[PDB]
């Protein structure tokens, strides 16, 4: 197989035709917000394939250092081409013109006009990331972390706007304790935040930014990212000030600070790590949050119609010619004719025609006036038994005496003189 | 044309590996009572031959995958967006040129309708 | 309407007993049927031949293709810019292949028929892709000599 030519080729070309995609994807203008939400999730898988045909085709360069000594030769060449032109010199008697060599690709990377949606894509829906009340990537649900958070606390004095807006806070006193409760449903309410960023927009690298976010963790948030003018540097996880920069270095490789504490750097690391990135996706996502604390305002403020309304978004002849007496024919769909003159044509007719097709039988002046099925297929059988038994059959018919005694059995038919004489 | 379509890329993977313009694997084979009907260019499947051989060449290149790896297109979507949304406005740039273009025509067309065709004059 | 050859191209001298003597070589013709006008009362130059194989009318039309009877073009077949008189022995791709050599074309064109034989009307309407083809073939082809038929090309709508 040459998969340094043939298949590093091909590779090529479906990443050229995945960069067509997406820059028709990109070019084309955009109507609604759903829809650009899937043909941006439509791009992301495409990407996504992209990069892993550009993984799979990275790879398979081992044997290429090996056989490019071989390939660039020129004393080799029309020997083993003529040996491969004779391996694909087989029967041609297969006359099928296959012109999806390059077709194939380019409409598995297309969308219809019914649905806006590409053949690997045809199975994605945004009913299944989003729900109905974030308005895919418009607004944020917060009932449910409300629900929880009146829960926990325990207590019926808190309603959406103030869990709004102590959600707010960023860098502020936080309305409970750092070593209580709060902490499981904050890490819940970070990796729902996580997953709201990361699906409000699809098309960005989700992986360097969370190694970013890890980096500004790591290097940053743990070496005193809030100075001040106890005051001067303040630790996340042991809650307690410092008196200078080496007293904090000092403390830092500290017994209790490390392990011997509830909310030391080893047990406390990862609440820290989801409050940190529950702080970049509020910073990140502000106007989100803040479109979703209108939106609830503006629910709140409304009544109850208009909630909903933002819820649910020569009569002589008639008797002389036969006029006025019906006839019906089962064999045309109890289809009921009128007046003799026209019934007795219908026989002749496409229609009739037509119905005794179904059942088989050909159409003759023998079947007229015949309106029932099971009369029909009766006298079918009574003609075809009377017509093949008044034909000359020699097959039946016959009387030869074969040559096996040549004076004795004629008895045989026209079968067994073959079988007899072959 | 499953056959056809193998031989122009079997004849395409050969010509690709020479060292001269002339002096090729296929070349050598006309004289061997080999029968290639798509080597001369009066064919249509001659322009086609043309396109395997120069994507057969540009698999060749060392930023192709024999002695270098892609970082950019394989490990960086900002980048592939940002080459997506440039032949989107090279396309976008075309069809400005083609509709220019048009109307340039059509300008001459209403210019060669309207001008006078009996003032004759034989120097 | 497989069996059957529809015949275009057929002048005063040809007749309805005549077709059938004439394609009798080709293949056993069991009927001739020719649809007279209802202003002139005559042939209207296409007609219809009903054979008894689908063999014989494939001989048929690859015989009598394109041949001169009567001093007519008569073509057996399978039953903005306006050319007029055309011959009903070329077809879509001839006719693009040879409207390619004043100018290009910007789709497949389009000939059109009668609506009781469906071979071909007379007229047929194909688009260029600038005025400059068109002009050329208003020039160029609207009186050129084709095949035994002296067609006439005119433009569909223009503008004062
Ligand atoms: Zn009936």
């Given at each position: 197989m040459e998969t340094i030519l043939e298949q590093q080729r091909r590779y090529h070309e479906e990443k050229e035709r995945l960069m067509d995609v997406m820059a028709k994807e990109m070019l084309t203008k955009k109507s609604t917000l759903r829809d650009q939400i899937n043909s941006d999730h439509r791009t992301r898988a495409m990407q996504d394939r992209y990069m892993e045909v550009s993984g799979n085709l990275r790879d398979l360069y081992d044997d290429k250092d090996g056989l490019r000594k071989e390939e660039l030769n020129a004393i080799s060449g029309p020997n083993e081409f003529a040996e491969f032109y004779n391996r694909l010199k087989q029967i041609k008697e297969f006359h099928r013109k296959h012109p999806n060599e390059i077709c194939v690709p380019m409409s598995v990377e297309f969308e219809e006009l019914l649905k806006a949606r590409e053949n690997p894509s045809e199975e994605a829906q945004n009913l299944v990331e989003f729900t109905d009340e974030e308005g895919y990537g418009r607004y944020l649900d917060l009932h449910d972390c409300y629900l929880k958070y009146i829960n926990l606390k325990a207590s019926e004095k808190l309603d959406y706007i103030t869990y709004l807006s102590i959600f707010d806070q960023l860098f502020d006193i936080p309305k409970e304790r750092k070593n209580a409760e709060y902490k499981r449903y904050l890490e819940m309410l970070l990796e729902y935040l996580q997953d709201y960023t990361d699906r409000v927009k699809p098309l960005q690298d989700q992986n360097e930014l969370f190694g970013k976010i890890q980096a500004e963790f790591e290097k940053k948030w743990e070496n005193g990212t809030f100075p001040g003018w106890e005051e001067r540097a303040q630790r996340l996880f042991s809650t307690k000030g410092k008196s200078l920069e080496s007293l904090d270095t000092s403390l830092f490789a500290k017994n209790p600070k490390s392990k011997g504490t509830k909310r030391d750097t080893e047990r406390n690391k990862d609440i820290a790590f989801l409050e940190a990135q529950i702080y970049e996706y509020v910073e990140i996502l502000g106007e989100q949050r803040h479109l979703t604390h209108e939106n609830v305002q503006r629910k709140q403020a409304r009544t109850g119609e208009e909630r909903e309304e933002e819820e649910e978004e020569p009569y002589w002849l008639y008797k002389l010619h036969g006029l006025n007496i019906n006839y019906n024919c089962e064999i045309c769909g109890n289809y009921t004719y009128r007046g003799p003159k026209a019934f007795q044509r219908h026989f002749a007719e496409w229609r009739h025609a037509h119905g005794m097709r179904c059942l088989g039988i050909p159409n003759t002046a023998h079947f007229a006036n015949v309106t029932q099925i099971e009369d029909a297929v009766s006298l079918w059988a009574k003609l075809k038994l009377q017509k093949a038994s008044e034909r000359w059959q020699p097959d039946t018919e016959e009387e030869y005496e074969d040559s096996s005694g040549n004076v004795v059995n004629k008895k045989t038919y026209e079968d067994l003189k073959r079988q007899g004489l072959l | 044309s499953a056959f056809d379509l193998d031989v122009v890329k079997l004849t395409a993977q050969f010509v690709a590996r020479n060292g001269r313009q002339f002096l090729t694997q296929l070349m050598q084979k006309e004289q061997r009572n080999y029968q290639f009907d798509?080597?001369?260019?009066?064919?249509?499947?001659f322009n086609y031959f043309t396109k395997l051989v120069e994507q057969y060449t540009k698999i060749l290149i060392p930023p192709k995958g024999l002695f270098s790896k892609l970082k950019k297109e394989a490990e960086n979507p900002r980048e592939v967006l940002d080459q997506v949304c440039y032949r989107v406005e090279w396309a976008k740039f075309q069809e400005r040129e083609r509709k220019k273009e048009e109307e340039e025509k059509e300008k001459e067309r209403v210019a060669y309708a309207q001008i006078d065709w009996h003032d004759f004059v034989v120097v | 309407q497989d069996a059957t050859v529809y015949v275009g191209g057929l002048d005063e001298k040809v007749s309805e007993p005549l077709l059938w003597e004439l394609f009798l070589q080709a293949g056993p013709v069991v009927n001739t049927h020719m649809p007279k006008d209802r202003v002139t009362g005559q042939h209207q130059g296409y007609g219809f031949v009903e054979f008894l194989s689908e063999e014989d009318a494939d001989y048929a039309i690859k015989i009598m293709n394109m041949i001169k009877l009567y001093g007519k073009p008569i073509r057996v077949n399978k039953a903005n810019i306006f050319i007029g008189n055309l011959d009903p022995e070329i077809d879509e791709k001839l006719l693009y292949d040879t409207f390619s050599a004043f100018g290009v074309i910007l789709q497949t064109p389009k000939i059109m028929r009668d609506p009781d034989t469906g071979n071909s009307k007379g007229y047929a309407f194909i688009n260029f892709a600038s005025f400059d083809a068109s002009d050329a073939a208003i020039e160029a082809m609207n009186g050129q000599y084709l095949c035994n038929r002296p067609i006439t090309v005119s433009y569909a709508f223009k503008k004062d």
């Open positions: - | 798509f080597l001369r260019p009066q064919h249509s499947l | -």
